[PDB]
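look at this fold:
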Amino acid sequence: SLKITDVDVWVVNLPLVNPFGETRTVVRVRTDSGVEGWGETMWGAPVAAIVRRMAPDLIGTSPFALEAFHRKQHMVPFFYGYLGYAAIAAVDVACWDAMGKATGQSVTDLLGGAVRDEVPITALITRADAPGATPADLPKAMAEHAVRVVEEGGFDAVKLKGTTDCAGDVAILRAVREALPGVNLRVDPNAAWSVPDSVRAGIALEELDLEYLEDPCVGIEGMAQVKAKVRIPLCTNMCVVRFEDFAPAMRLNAVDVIHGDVYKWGGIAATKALAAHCETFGLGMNLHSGGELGIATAAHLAVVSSTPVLSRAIDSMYYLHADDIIEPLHLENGRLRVPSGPGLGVSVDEDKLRHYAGVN
């Protein structure tokens, strides 16, 4: 039968360090077989509250009954939005971990098997990296920092956090590109630019051959307008964040690349599904990072490892991790190695978990 006996939730605070704090919700699914599954998702109090309100509904169910579980909680995201999907995702991941353990198989092998064993990641640079720089000096300052990060980290891709200062972002990107001719370069204004400014800036950025322009403006409508004029692949993890957004986005030709994210889409199967959708519509795909630590990153690595279309250097703030409730993942020369053991391939230190829950 394999039934779930307990669902426990902890909210923890872990330190972060830039080699060049954060709050997360952790969930444990216990089964009458002795097998335990772990999951980690974003934020604390509010997400932890949603999971506990769903816990009673999981007692007595099989961790293998994910389809039944998701259908049962389909209205949760309707009311709780992003946090709803994130709460669901934590439970989703814990069940997959439990499934791998119950079958003695890696989550990767339960998702189709590995097609790649190493997962390249991206280096994020923000203006906060050049505190002293003045407007006229900021570009050179960022380029120098970019070069340092790339050589010290071995990153295949670099991503700039854009601001409402379009002209300034463009100035920075030009400097970075001139200093790093062969790196995959991206910019993410987080929908801070207006459509008219996105077109003007986009046109100016075409000569830099960026891997993609990420969320320059808000909405499917605005994004479609940018795509119609700017000759740069357009990416998003803001205007298409659920399947209900997919069909409309495709009919309006709003994007060229979509960012997957288990914690944003509610689970592993949904993300594998999204990968299928992207291939069908000739869209590129990558994964977005919302501060995942070891457990969460492990789930993502299993997805990337078993998914052909995820051939790009993913976004990952995992290189900022210090102490974690599990053993450090293998991050070397800009790439993360996909864990090998049963389930997610990670072991959780409960003492530390209890410790960091007290910090929170």
Q: What stands out?
A: Residues 56 and 179 are 56 Å apart (CA to CA).
